[PDB]
């Protein structure tokens, strides 16, 4: 099933630290938030390369989705990534790292911007997304139509990107959205951050009668709730009213998945909700929780690409999630045992 899936996002490496209370409140920062850098962050940027503590970890979004879906379906080449990189080591470290993983990894390149980076700030297994978009920004609709790429956008069949590219390129999006429109594929995005849902709200309601699975949790799902103006925060509610919202076309009902961290995953399928406790990791085994939705999505989208259930989509999305919250940033053992 070579290319079944296919991502489009921004890549970006992880400069992870576990770091404390007083350091969030320096650079105005909140736990469990995703932000866009600002000049501010420069000297947060320099402060976290001098902790001895720092990783340098592979992440972007829907980059580690994608990692963790080919890991759960453990055939070489079954999913394929679309994103920009600099020319430099950090893009060259991250491509040799997805693509001995199993995936076909396809990069555009900016000429003169670094690769993207993210700061992931760590606090008591929690943590806190400054993103330092840099060449990622740049990716090219060029690249998407060049027909060695468009290649693998007809190969597949389930297409996902995380709602954070659609600071970047809405309009290879579009194109991507309106391909799996008339031929029956399915596009899938994620909210991403509460950012994404405020100020990206326009370009995300122009792609959102294209989307046939709609991922979240429940501070972005309690954010898009409070921006269409739907006076209400119950999670069960905002699931059923995100799946109602209009459809370009009705080849696909919309699916709304929103995970609650170690509360019930929430899912609304056909207007019922069913919901799928977790199966917390004890405090003493957790890392961190950076890239646990992401992980969840790899896991749930590994099985839908299967012809699987939705109720073991989620199973194997709760799986991928407890193992990676096991280890620091989006991090994984060589094979799994789901
Ligand atoms: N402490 C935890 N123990 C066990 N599983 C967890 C824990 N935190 C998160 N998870 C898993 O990760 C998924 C995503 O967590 P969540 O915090 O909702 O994601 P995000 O990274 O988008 O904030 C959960 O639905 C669950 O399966
Ligand atoms: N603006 C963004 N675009 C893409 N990925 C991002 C962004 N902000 C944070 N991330 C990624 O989110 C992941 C955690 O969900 C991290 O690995 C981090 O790289
Ligand atoms: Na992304």
């Not at 394929?80 to 790292?97: A, I, N, P, Q, T």
């Not at 119950?234 to 699916?255: C, E, M, N, Q, S």
């Not at 069913?274 to 939705?293: H, R, Y």
């Amino acid at each position: 099933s070579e290319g079944v899936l296919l991502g489009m996002g921004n890549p970006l490496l992880d400069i992870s630290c576990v770091v404390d209370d007083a350091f969030l409140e320096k650079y105005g920062l909140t736990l469990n938030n995703a932000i866009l850098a600002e000049d501010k962050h420069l000297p947060m940027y320099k402060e976290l390369a001098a902790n001895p503590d720092v990783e340098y970890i592979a992440g972007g979004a829907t980059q580690n989705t994608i990692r963790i879906a080919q890991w759960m379906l453990g055939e070489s080449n079954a999913t394929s990534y679309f994103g920009c990189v600099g020319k430099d080591e950090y893009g060259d470290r991250m491509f040799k790292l997805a693509s001995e993983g199993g995936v076909n990894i396809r990069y555009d390149v900016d000429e003169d911007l670094p690769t993207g980076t993210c700061g992931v700030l760590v606090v008591k297994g929690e943590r806190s997304l400054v993103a330092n978009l840099s060449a990622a920004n740049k990716y090219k609709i060029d690249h998407l139509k060049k027909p060695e790429n468009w290649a693998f956008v007809e190969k597949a069949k389930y297409i996902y990107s995380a709602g954070f590219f659609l600071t970047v390129s809405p309009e290879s999006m579009m194109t991507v959205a309106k391909h799996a429109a008339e031929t029956g594929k399915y596009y899938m995005i994620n909210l991403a951050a509460p950012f994404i849902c405020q100020f990206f709200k326009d370009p995300l309601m122009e792609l959102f009668p294209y989307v046939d699975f709609i991922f979240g949790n429940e501070s972005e799902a309690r954010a898009f709730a409070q921006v269409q103006g739907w006076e209400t925060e119950d999670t069960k509610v905002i699931a059923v009213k995100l799946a109602a919202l209009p459809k370009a076309g009705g080849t696909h009902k919309r699916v709304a998945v929103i995970t609650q961290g170690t509360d019930p995953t929430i899912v609304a399928e056909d207007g019922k909700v069913t919901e799928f406790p977790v199966t917390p990791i004890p405090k003493e085994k957790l890392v961190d929780t950076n890239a646990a939705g992401d992980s969840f999505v790899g896991g749930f989208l590994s099985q839908l690409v299967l012809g699987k259930d939705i109720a073991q989509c989620v199973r194997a999305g709760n799986y991928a999630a407890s193992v990676i919250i096991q280890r620091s940033g989006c991090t994984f053992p060589s094979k799994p045992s789901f």
